[PDB]
Amino acid sequence: PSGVEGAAFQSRLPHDRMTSQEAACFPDIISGPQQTQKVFLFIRNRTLQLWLDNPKIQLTFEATLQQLEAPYNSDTVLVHRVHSYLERHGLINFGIYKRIKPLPTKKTGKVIIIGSGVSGLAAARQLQSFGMDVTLLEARDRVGGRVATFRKGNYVADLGAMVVTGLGGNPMAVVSKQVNMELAKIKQKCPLYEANGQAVPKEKDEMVEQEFNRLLEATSYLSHQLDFNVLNNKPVSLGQALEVVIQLQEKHVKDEQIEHWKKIVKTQEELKELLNKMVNLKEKIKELHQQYKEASEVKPPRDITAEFLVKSKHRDLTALCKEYDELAETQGKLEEKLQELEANPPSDVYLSSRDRQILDWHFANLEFANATPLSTLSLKHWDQDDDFEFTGSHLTVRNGYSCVPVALAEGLDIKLNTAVRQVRYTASGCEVIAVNTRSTSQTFIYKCDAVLCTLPLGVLKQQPPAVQFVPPLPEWKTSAVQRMGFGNLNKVVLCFDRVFWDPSVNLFGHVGSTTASRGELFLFWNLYKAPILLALVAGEAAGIMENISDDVIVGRCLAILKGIFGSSAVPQPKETVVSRWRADPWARGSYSYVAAGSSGNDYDLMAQPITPGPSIPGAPQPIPRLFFAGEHTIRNYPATVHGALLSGLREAGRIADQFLGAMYTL
Amino acid sequence: RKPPKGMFLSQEDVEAVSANATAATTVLRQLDMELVSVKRQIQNIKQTNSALKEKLDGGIEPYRLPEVIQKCNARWTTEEQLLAVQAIRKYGRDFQAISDVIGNKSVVQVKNFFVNYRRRFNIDEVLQEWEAE
Ligand SMILES: Cc1cc2nc3c(=O)[nH]c(=O)nc-3n(C[C@H](O)[C@H](O)[C@H](O)COP(=O)(O)OP(=O)(O)OC[C@H]3O[C@@H](n4cnc5c(N)ncnc54)[C@H](O)[C@@H]3O)c2cc1C
Ligand SMILES: CN1CCC(Oc2ccc(OCc3ccc(NC(=O)c4cc5sccc5n4C)cc3)cc2)CC1
Ligand SMILES: CN1CCC(Oc2ccc(OCc3ccc(NC(=O)c4cc5sccc5n4C)cc3)cc2)CC1
């Protein structure tokens, strides 16, 4: 992608068509002639190009109109509408940028944002950029939320977010230019080491990884081609479909063997009836040769009847000897046809125990990416966001992912150690009740015109609730919270004093012994120059490892490394850090997944703002007061940092259009 | 449109495994027992054949007669005429057999013999007596 067309792809927009959101803001254009639409589309793409070519300074309307050319810079109110639209919905002038026009003299409207995560910080940045009084309430003693970086000296290791999932269309590509992010690629070579310490040969590493990807395509065939999506009233999960496909492959292996050995009995039984015909023919030939001999003992001269007897027995014996030769000819073809079938037997098994364990490692890597056991992912909707994956090599933050939320929090009114306990929204305004986390006997009251709630989806699931909503959230909202799934994921940081592994090998895997423990310390990371091994815990093991102390978790870590690198070449780590995101009261899990029985439509339900009832019976329809942003509210980019980043920009533009007015729609 | 080349996911097989909870193990056991049943049925026929193969030991070599091809003559001698009548009585209309019994008479000559001496040798009676057996 290049030119103004590439800037549209970078902003996740089609360059040749107006989007659904643009139709609501420019209904006079999309309903008008095609010439007006293409003029509008160029102004939109050209404005995005100017912002992306230098996202460290603000792109004013005076700058956009200056760098435009006729006939595109003739309609000025159109350029003003396009620029004000892109600025409002976070497509331009978002993140961290030098402001050309300093902030308004006084602010308009009061907004309380619950949570200082990436989603909350992004919205607070844009809402304050629009000229509103924004205040964030964070329960932790830090910003970032699920973007937590561990630093002790030169040591840096992300306990939360770690990977940037490509830059092609990623808003983080804009943030990586505004913030001193040190992005480094990931070598996708992962040697597998079995439980005995010895490595997996390249023979099985490919013939199992290929069979793994072929099992996933098979589940998609089960879902979209056979409609295998409901099994006895309950929705089918990805784990169910995988076991069904595997059992069908083991079934086909047995069917091939039965029909192969059945070819042998069918042929071996032909040989049985042929040998029985040969043994009966040999007995007739043995008897006929005796009768022919006795007829020849009759010494000449003899009458024509005794002479015909010898000629007759000779012809009859020659005829029987002709049949026996043809049967021995058939015996030769059947006897070597049996050596043909018994030399090409079908596969003995589908997957051996050694193969099935290596396959379980790839299943564990899938349970890591989705942060939940495969028995909970929806077979139909677990890969719904696949079409919106960015392009490019996936990178990591060499200086720590926490540098982004720290830099976004610059210049914002953030109240740390402030746990929100009750959210009250009425027709005339809102009040947020919170306490100080260091001493809960100290209560704070915050009045505002609108509340933006970025509470983690696990916090919204708490029972009894950690945050009380007054009035209660409607059923369609609460039911959508219970339908969605919130996963679990854990890392183990091992800080040594020197490197004892391969510096060229970025990462190596460990193949567990049991299917029930396939995710227990299955992958080890080494990213930076510093001696920090990063062990991964995923799947069903993620929730069980939280109930195990740190010294025991490090014990199982060293037990794996001692068998791989040597019993003496593994020193004791000087610093150990183990995450417990499910036990974290401010997260209650890792991130969201499309659980079975849920769908992508629940992600849009999570974003619909709540509107209170009228204060007086017979009063006009009130204003939406309670808004929801966060990682769990964006349908096409869930469970990611850039998804929460975009979700914050979304509600910030929605709240601004509600309380500041959208003047760009005339 | 079709499963990945190597997967065998027919609509019929999916429902047979997803019936009940243990329908997967039930199907896979009936194929394991059918594999055992067929496998030991092999070594039963495989032993029956190996036992019959030893009865055919030596072939039929002590029973073959040496090859003797003679000049296909033309004159029907008084001896060869009587050999033909007995061949018709025993073999009927199998001219290839009658030609081999006489030896020095072609198959076309045997068929011409059936018409020339049809009068004096009463071949119609000889043939209808062969049809009794
Ligand atoms: C282990 C792990 C690894 C991850 N790795 C990646 C990755 O590699 N790539 C990627 O794209 N994404 C990754 N993610 C997901 C990513 O971190 C999230 O999508 C994103 O950080 C969510 O941001 P948010 O602001 O929506 O939620 P959060 O970051 O959780 O922000 C919500 C804030 O609300 C605060 N809060 C909670 N309860 C209260 C309360 N009662 N009162 C007041 N405040 C409260 C919390 O402290 C938190 O600061 C990972 C997540 C985890 C857990
Ligand atoms: C040989 N064969 C062996 C296996 C290889 O497969 C791999 C090769 C290298 C491999 O690197 C290790 C690796 C790299 C990245 C990630 N991703 C994340 O952590 C992540 C990104 C995002 S976005 C929202 C959540 C999230 N998460 C969790 C996890 C592991 C991982 C697997 C492929 C080659
Ligand atoms: C589709 N895709 C599959 C993997 C292929 O190769 C790789 C691509 C990226 C590679 O970086 C590592 C990596 C690892 C995990 C994910 N997972 C997610 O982002 C994700 C999707 C969904 S749906 C609900 C949650 C969720 N999440 C979290 C992303 C990237 C590593 C390898 C490329 C094509």
JSON list of C-alpha atoms in Angstrom, two decimals, chain B residues 27-133:
[
{"chain": "B", "resi": 27, "resn": "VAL", "atom": "CA", "xyz": [-17.11, -47.55, 17.41]},
{"chain": "B", "resi": 28, "resn": "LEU", "atom": "CA", "xyz": [-13.34, -47.81, 17.87]},
{"chain": "B", "resi": 29, "resn": "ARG", "atom": "CA", "xyz": [-13.67, -51.08, 19.81]},
{"chain": "B", "resi": 30, "resn": "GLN", "atom": "CA", "xyz": [-15.88, -52.82, 17.23]},
{"chain": "B", "resi": 31, "resn": "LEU", "atom": "CA", "xyz": [-13.19, -52.06, 14.65]},
{"chain": "B", "resi": 32, "resn": "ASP", "atom": "CA", "xyz": [-10.43, -53.35, 16.94]},
{"chain": "B", "resi": 33, "resn": "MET", "atom": "CA", "xyz": [-12.32, -56.62, 17.46]},
{"chain": "B", "resi": 34, "resn": "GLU", "atom": "CA", "xyz": [-13.10, -56.89, 13.74]},
{"chain": "B", "resi": 35, "resn": "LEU", "atom": "CA", "xyz": [-9.38, -56.47, 13.09]},
{"chain": "B", "resi": 36, "resn": "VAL", "atom": "CA", "xyz": [-8.59, -59.31, 15.50]},
{"chain": "B", "resi": 37, "resn": "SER", "atom": "CA", "xyz": [-11.30, -61.52, 14.00]},
{"chain": "B", "resi": 38, "resn": "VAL", "atom": "CA", "xyz": [-10.00, -61.08, 10.45]},
{"chain": "B", "resi": 39, "resn": "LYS", "atom": "CA", "xyz": [-6.33, -61.35, 11.43]},
{"chain": "B", "resi": 40, "resn": "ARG", "atom": "CA", "xyz": [-6.66, -64.78, 13.04]},
{"chain": "B", "resi": 41, "resn": "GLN", "atom": "CA", "xyz": [-8.98, -65.88, 10.23]},
{"chain": "B", "resi": 42, "resn": "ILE", "atom": "CA", "xyz": [-5.96, -65.22, 7.99]},
{"chain": "B", "resi": 43, "resn": "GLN", "atom": "CA", "xyz": [-3.58, -67.52, 9.86]},
{"chain": "B", "resi": 44, "resn": "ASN", "atom": "CA", "xyz": [-6.31, -70.18, 9.83]},
{"chain": "B", "resi": 45, "resn": "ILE", "atom": "CA", "xyz": [-6.58, -70.07, 6.03]},
{"chain": "B", "resi": 46, "resn": "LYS", "atom": "CA", "xyz": [-2.84, -69.36, 5.87]},
{"chain": "B", "resi": 47, "resn": "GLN", "atom": "CA", "xyz": [-2.21, -72.67, 7.65]},
{"chain": "B", "resi": 48, "resn": "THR", "atom": "CA", "xyz": [-4.82, -74.57, 5.61]},
{"chain": "B", "resi": 49, "resn": "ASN", "atom": "CA", "xyz": [-3.12, -73.43, 2.40]},
{"chain": "B", "resi": 50, "resn": "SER", "atom": "CA", "xyz": [0.36, -74.24, 3.71]},
{"chain": "B", "resi": 51, "resn": "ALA", "atom": "CA", "xyz": [-0.87, -77.75, 4.54]},
{"chain": "B", "resi": 52, "resn": "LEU", "atom": "CA", "xyz": [-2.35, -78.27, 1.07]},
{"chain": "B", "resi": 53, "resn": "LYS", "atom": "CA", "xyz": [0.82, -76.92, -0.57]},
{"chain": "B", "resi": 54, "resn": "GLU", "atom": "CA", "xyz": [2.79, -79.87, 0.81]},
{"chain": "B", "resi": 55, "resn": "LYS", "atom": "CA", "xyz": [0.31, -82.35, -0.67]},
{"chain": "B", "resi": 56, "resn": "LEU", "atom": "CA", "xyz": [1.27, -80.94, -4.09]},
{"chain": "B", "resi": 57, "resn": "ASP", "atom": "CA", "xyz": [4.97, -81.53, -3.36]},
{"chain": "B", "resi": 58, "resn": "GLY", "atom": "CA", "xyz": [6.76, -82.84, -6.43]},
{"chain": "B", "resi": 59, "resn": "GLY", "atom": "CA", "xyz": [4.17, -81.56, -8.88]},
{"chain": "B", "resi": 60, "resn": "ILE", "atom": "CA", "xyz": [2.96, -84.08, -11.44]},
{"chain": "B", "resi": 61, "resn": "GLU", "atom": "CA", "xyz": [6.39, -84.77, -12.93]},
{"chain": "B", "resi": 62, "resn": "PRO", "atom": "CA", "xyz": [6.38, -88.58, -12.39]},
{"chain": "B", "resi": 63, "resn": "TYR", "atom": "CA", "xyz": [3.12, -88.59, -14.37]},
{"chain": "B", "resi": 64, "resn": "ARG", "atom": "CA", "xyz": [3.81, -86.56, -17.52]},
{"chain": "B", "resi": 65, "resn": "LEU", "atom": "CA", "xyz": [4.11, -88.47, -20.77]},
{"chain": "B", "resi": 66, "resn": "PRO", "atom": "CA", "xyz": [6.80, -87.58, -23.32]},
{"chain": "B", "resi": 67, "resn": "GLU", "atom": "CA", "xyz": [5.85, -85.37, -26.26]},
{"chain": "B", "resi": 68, "resn": "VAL", "atom": "CA", "xyz": [5.24, -87.14, -29.59]},
{"chain": "B", "resi": 69, "resn": "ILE", "atom": "CA", "xyz": [4.18, -85.09, -32.63]},
{"chain": "B", "resi": 70, "resn": "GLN", "atom": "CA", "xyz": [3.65, -87.12, -35.80]},
{"chain": "B", "resi": 71, "resn": "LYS", "atom": "CA", "xyz": [3.10, -86.18, -39.44]},
{"chain": "B", "resi": 72, "resn": "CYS", "atom": "CA", "xyz": [-0.55, -85.26, -39.99]},
{"chain": "B", "resi": 73, "resn": "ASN", "atom": "CA", "xyz": [-1.26, -87.85, -42.68]},
{"chain": "B", "resi": 74, "resn": "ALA", "atom": "CA", "xyz": [-4.15, -87.94, -45.18]},
{"chain": "B", "resi": 75, "resn": "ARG", "atom": "CA", "xyz": [-5.06, -91.56, -45.99]},
{"chain": "B", "resi": 76, "resn": "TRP", "atom": "CA", "xyz": [-7.56, -92.98, -43.49]},
{"chain": "B", "resi": 77, "resn": "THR", "atom": "CA", "xyz": [-6.16, -96.44, -42.86]},
{"chain": "B", "resi": 78, "resn": "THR", "atom": "CA", "xyz": [-8.45, -99.27, -41.76]},
{"chain": "B", "resi": 79, "resn": "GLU", "atom": "CA", "xyz": [-6.87, -99.02, -38.31]},
{"chain": "B", "resi": 80, "resn": "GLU", "atom": "CA", "xyz": [-7.40, -95.27, -37.99]},
{"chain": "B", "resi": 81, "resn": "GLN", "atom": "CA", "xyz": [-11.03, -95.61, -39.10]},
{"chain": "B", "resi": 82, "resn": "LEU", "atom": "CA", "xyz": [-11.83, -97.88, -36.14]},
{"chain": "B", "resi": 83, "resn": "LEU", "atom": "CA", "xyz": [-10.04, -95.54, -33.73]},
{"chain": "B", "resi": 84, "resn": "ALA", "atom": "CA", "xyz": [-12.30, -92.71, -34.91]},
{"chain": "B", "resi": 85, "resn": "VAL", "atom": "CA", "xyz": [-15.53, -94.67, -34.38]},
{"chain": "B", "resi": 86, "resn": "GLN", "atom": "CA", "xyz": [-14.53, -95.48, -30.79]},
{"chain": "B", "resi": 87, "resn": "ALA", "atom": "CA", "xyz": [-13.49, -91.85, -30.27]},
{"chain": "B", "resi": 88, "resn": "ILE", "atom": "CA", "xyz": [-16.93, -90.66, -31.42]},
{"chain": "B", "resi": 89, "resn": "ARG", "atom": "CA", "xyz": [-18.56, -93.17, -29.06]},
{"chain": "B", "resi": 90, "resn": "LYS", "atom": "CA", "xyz": [-16.47, -91.89, -26.13]},
{"chain": "B", "resi": 91, "resn": "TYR", "atom": "CA", "xyz": [-15.96, -88.18, -26.91]},
{"chain": "B", "resi": 92, "resn": "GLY", "atom": "CA", "xyz": [-18.95, -87.35, -29.12]},
{"chain": "B", "resi": 93, "resn": "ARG", "atom": "CA", "xyz": [-18.33, -84.14, -31.06]},
{"chain": "B", "resi": 94, "resn": "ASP", "atom": "CA", "xyz": [-15.05, -83.09, -29.41]},
{"chain": "B", "resi": 95, "resn": "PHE", "atom": "CA", "xyz": [-13.03, -83.07, -32.63]},
{"chain": "B", "resi": 96, "resn": "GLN", "atom": "CA", "xyz": [-9.87, -81.80, -30.93]},
{"chain": "B", "resi": 97, "resn": "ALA", "atom": "CA", "xyz": [-9.93, -84.84, -28.65]},
{"chain": "B", "resi": 98, "resn": "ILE", "atom": "CA", "xyz": [-10.65, -87.22, -31.54]},
{"chain": "B", "resi": 99, "resn": "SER", "atom": "CA", "xyz": [-7.77, -85.67, -33.49]},
{"chain": "B", "resi": 100, "resn": "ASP", "atom": "CA", "xyz": [-5.41, -86.22, -30.55]},
{"chain": "B", "resi": 101, "resn": "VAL", "atom": "CA", "xyz": [-6.58, -89.81, -30.06]},
{"chain": "B", "resi": 102, "resn": "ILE", "atom": "CA", "xyz": [-5.89, -90.70, -33.69]},
{"chain": "B", "resi": 103, "resn": "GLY", "atom": "CA", "xyz": [-2.82, -88.47, -33.76]},
{"chain": "B", "resi": 104, "resn": "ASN", "atom": "CA", "xyz": [-2.14, -88.18, -37.50]},
{"chain": "B", "resi": 105, "resn": "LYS", "atom": "CA", "xyz": [-5.45, -86.54, -38.47]},
{"chain": "B", "resi": 106, "resn": "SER", "atom": "CA", "xyz": [-6.20, -82.82, -38.51]},
{"chain": "B", "resi": 107, "resn": "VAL", "atom": "CA", "xyz": [-9.32, -81.35, -36.91]},
{"chain": "B", "resi": 108, "resn": "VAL", "atom": "CA", "xyz": [-10.73, -80.50, -40.35]},
{"chain": "B", "resi": 109, "resn": "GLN", "atom": "CA", "xyz": [-10.15, -84.09, -41.51]},
{"chain": "B", "resi": 110, "resn": "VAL", "atom": "CA", "xyz": [-11.99, -85.37, -38.44]},
{"chain": "B", "resi": 111, "resn": "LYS", "atom": "CA", "xyz": [-14.95, -83.14, -39.29]},
{"chain": "B", "resi": 112, "resn": "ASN", "atom": "CA", "xyz": [-14.87, -84.31, -42.91]},
{"chain": "B", "resi": 113, "resn": "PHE", "atom": "CA", "xyz": [-14.75, -87.89, -41.59]},
{"chain": "B", "resi": 114, "resn": "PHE", "atom": "CA", "xyz": [-18.03, -87.13, -39.78]},
{"chain": "B", "resi": 115, "resn": "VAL", "atom": "CA", "xyz": [-19.74, -86.56, -43.15]},
{"chain": "B", "resi": 116, "resn": "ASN", "atom": "CA", "xyz": [-18.03, -88.96, -45.59]},
{"chain": "B", "resi": 117, "resn": "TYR", "atom": "CA", "xyz": [-18.28, -92.14, -43.50]},
{"chain": "B", "resi": 118, "resn": "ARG", "atom": "CA", "xyz": [-21.49, -90.86, -41.89]},
{"chain": "B", "resi": 119, "resn": "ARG", "atom": "CA", "xyz": [-23.28, -93.42, -44.07]},
{"chain": "B", "resi": 120, "resn": "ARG", "atom": "CA", "xyz": [-21.37, -96.66, -43.50]},
{"chain": "B", "resi": 121, "resn": "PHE", "atom": "CA", "xyz": [-20.32, -96.13, -39.86]},
{"chain": "B", "resi": 122, "resn": "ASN", "atom": "CA", "xyz": [-23.77, -95.11, -38.52]},
{"chain": "B", "resi": 123, "resn": "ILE", "atom": "CA", "xyz": [-22.32, -92.03, -36.82]},
{"chain": "B", "resi": 124, "resn": "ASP", "atom": "CA", "xyz": [-25.86, -90.86, -36.00]},
{"chain": "B", "resi": 125, "resn": "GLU", "atom": "CA", "xyz": [-26.40, -93.93, -33.81]},
{"chain": "B", "resi": 126, "resn": "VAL", "atom": "CA", "xyz": [-22.91, -93.65, -32.30]},
{"chain": "B", "resi": 127, "resn": "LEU", "atom": "CA", "xyz": [-23.48, -90.00, -31.37]},
{"chain": "B", "resi": 128, "resn": "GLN", "atom": "CA", "xyz": [-26.93, -90.53, -29.85]},
{"chain": "B", "resi": 129, "resn": "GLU", "atom": "CA", "xyz": [-25.48, -93.37, -27.74]},
{"chain": "B", "resi": 130, "resn": "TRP", "atom": "CA", "xyz": [-22.79, -91.00, -26.46]},
{"chain": "B", "resi": 131, "resn": "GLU", "atom": "CA", "xyz": [-25.52, -88.54, -25.43]},
{"chain": "B", "resi": 132, "resn": "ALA", "atom": "CA", "xyz": [-26.76, -91.16, -22.95]},
{"chain": "B", "resi": 133, "resn": "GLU", "atom": "CA", "xyz": [-23.59, -90.81, -20.87]}
]
